[PDB]
């Protein structure tokens, strides 16, 4: 019957569905409207883990906060580090911690899905073919999306974009963009740092402040007001992954192109 796999975030469900089809029944630990960095799994969720045949970790220390509770919920549960074999980027803040947001890189997702499929075929060999097949289809979908995002951003005069939460480092890396984070987690306590950001923005004529759906937009609205730019939201946990990245790229493009 359908194999019960659990994942940390909505985007992973997208990948598991593409790879597993009706052979998997995916459960998500962190809701899309929540900040996974300060998320605490609920008791009902820990209880349900006893049925999970495996759990797909994002890796790179993303699940560290509840990593142990997971093993305690089920030691038999196979932990799938979907980030293995990938060279990570350093976090914007402290330059000695890996950046976990690799699920927003189409190219890197190819690797993530490949690790998932390989692992699903080990627990359920009979369907090894459907997994490898679904994987191939998905990969090709990825290269397509990758190429599509490239034609939207490549010609953009402006390569920098201001974000609240720094969750697009890997995405901005693939398409030669630079995210300027409003939030930090261990950098310089310079209370005026946000002022340097505003002046840099004004001089480069940045026209938009991209806040994240999972966080308050207060500080982004203020920043934007001061820079004279607009405020838009990007949803890094959107379940509708593929279509979401395209909308994102499109917003970037509308903001980083010669303006009216
Ligand atoms: Zn994040």
């Amino acid at each position: 019957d359908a194999m019960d796999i659990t994942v940390s975030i909505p985007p992973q469900q997208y990948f598991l569905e593409k790879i597993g089809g009706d052979l998997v029944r995916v459960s998500v630990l962190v809701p899309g409207n929540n900040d996974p960095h300060t998320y605490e799994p609920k008791p009902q969720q820990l209880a349900a883990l006893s049925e999970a045949e495996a759990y797909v970790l994002i890796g790179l220390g993303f699940e560290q906060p509840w990593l142990e509770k997971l093993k305690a919920a089920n030691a038999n549960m196979k932990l799938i580090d979907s980030a293995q074999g990938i060279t990570p980027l350093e976090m914007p803040g402290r330059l000695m911690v890996a950046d976990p947001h690799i699920w927003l890189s189409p190219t890197l997702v190819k690797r993530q899905a490949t690790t998932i499929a390989k692992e699903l075929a080990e627990l359920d060999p009979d369907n090894r073919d459907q997994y490898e097949a679904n994987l191939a289809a998905f990969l090709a979908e990825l290269e397509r999306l990758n190429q599509e995002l490239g034609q939207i951003l490549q010609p953009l005069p402006q390569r920098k974009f201001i974000v609240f939460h720094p969750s697009w480092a890997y995405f901005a890396r693939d398409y030669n963009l630079v995210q300027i984070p409003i939030e930090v987690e261990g950098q310089e306590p310079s209370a005026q740092e946000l002022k340097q950001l505003i002046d840099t923005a004004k001089e480069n004529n940045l026209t938009m402040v991209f806040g994240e759906t999972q966080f308050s937009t207060k500080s982004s609205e203020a920043i934007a007001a001061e820079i004279g730019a607009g405020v838009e939201l990007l949803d890094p946990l959107a379940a509708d992954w593929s279509s979401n990245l395209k909308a994102v790229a499109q917003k970037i493009a509308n903001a980083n192109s010669a303006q009216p």
Side-chain angles (χ1 to χ4, degrees), residues 35-37 62 101 103 165-167 215:
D35 167 23
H37 293 295
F62 190 66
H101 317 88
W103 75 82
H165 194 79
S167 72
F215 306 89

Side-chain angles (χ1 to χ4, degrees), residues 4 8 28 119 135 152 184 260:
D4 289 312
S8 301
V28 183
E119 299 293 279
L135 216 200
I152 308 168
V184 302

Side-chain angles (χ1 to χ4, degrees), residues 1-23:
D1 201 7
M3 199 164 259
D4 289 312
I5 293 74
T6 296
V7 301
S8 301
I9 48 177
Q12 291 176 289
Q13 172 176 51
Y14 186 83
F15 315 156
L16 259 296
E17 232 68 51
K18 284 289 180 176
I19 301 171
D22 58 17
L23 302 184

Side-chain angles (χ1 to χ4, degrees), residues 7-220:
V7 301
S8 301
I9 48 177
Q12 291 176 289
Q13 172 176 51
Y14 186 83
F15 315 156
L16 259 296
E17 232 68 51
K18 284 289 180 176
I19 301 171
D22 58 17
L23 302 184
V24 308
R25 185 169 308 188
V26 185
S27 287
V28 183
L29 179 69
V30 189
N33 50 27
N34 283 202
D35 167 23
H37 293 295
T38 69
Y39 185 77
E40 190 74 17
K42 318 309 166 197
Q44 180 190 312
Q45 295 180 298
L46 296 171
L49 284 174
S50 72
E51 306 294 293
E53 295 196 19
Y55 186 111
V56 189
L57 304 163
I58 273 100
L60 295 172
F62 190 66
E63 294 79 15
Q64 176 60 206
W66 357 288
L67 216 181
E68 287 292 286
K69 293 201 198 55
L70 295 175
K71 279 199 288 292
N74 190 330
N76 312 309
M77 183 174 82
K78 182 73 184 70
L79 302 181
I80 314 175
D81 181 1
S82 67
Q84 58 146 167
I86 307 188
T87 300
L89 284 176
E90 296 168 297
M91 268 288 267
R94 43 187 316 184
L95 299 67
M96 292 203 84
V97 174
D99 185 328
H101 317 88
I102 74 293
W103 75 82
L104 299 165
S105 164
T107 295
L108 261 34
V109 163
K110 295 184 185 182
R111 209 303 151 300
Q112 289 154 64
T114 301
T115 297
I116 303 313
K118 185 181 183 305
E119 299 293 279
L120 287 176
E122 301 172 2
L123 304 173
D124 195 34
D126 299 330
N127 304 305
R128 178 188 196 65
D129 64 300
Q130 304 196 201
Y131 293 127
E132 297 197 351
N134 290 333
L135 216 200
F138 191 30
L139 292 173
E141 271 176 48
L142 294 166
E143 240 302 289
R144 206 135 54 221
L145 167 68
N146 174 48
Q147 289 286 332
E148 220 179 318
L149 297 163
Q151 255 175 295
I152 308 168
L153 288 9
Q154 175 279 303
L156 309 179
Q158 180 55 252
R159 315 306 306 164
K160 304 181 298 303
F161 58 126
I162 300 168
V163 290
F164 173 61
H165 194 79
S167 72
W168 312 90
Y170 290 104
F171 173 96
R173 250 280 180 293
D174 303 332
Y175 309 112
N176 311 106
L177 295 174
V178 186
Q179 77 173 166
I180 313 307
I182 300 295
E183 181 196 320
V184 302
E185 293 297 303
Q187 199 67 303
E188 313 184 67
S190 190
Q192 274 191 47
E193 68 183 311
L194 247 47
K195 180 64 189 314
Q196 164 80 83
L197 174 158
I198 299 180
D199 295 330
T200 289
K202 293 185 177 186
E203 296 160 4
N204 293 310
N205 194 199
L206 297 187
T207 71
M208 198 72 66
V209 170
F210 297 98
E212 277 48 60
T213 307
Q214 295 75 204
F215 306 89
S216 162
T217 51
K218 285 286 181 62
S219 60
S220 294

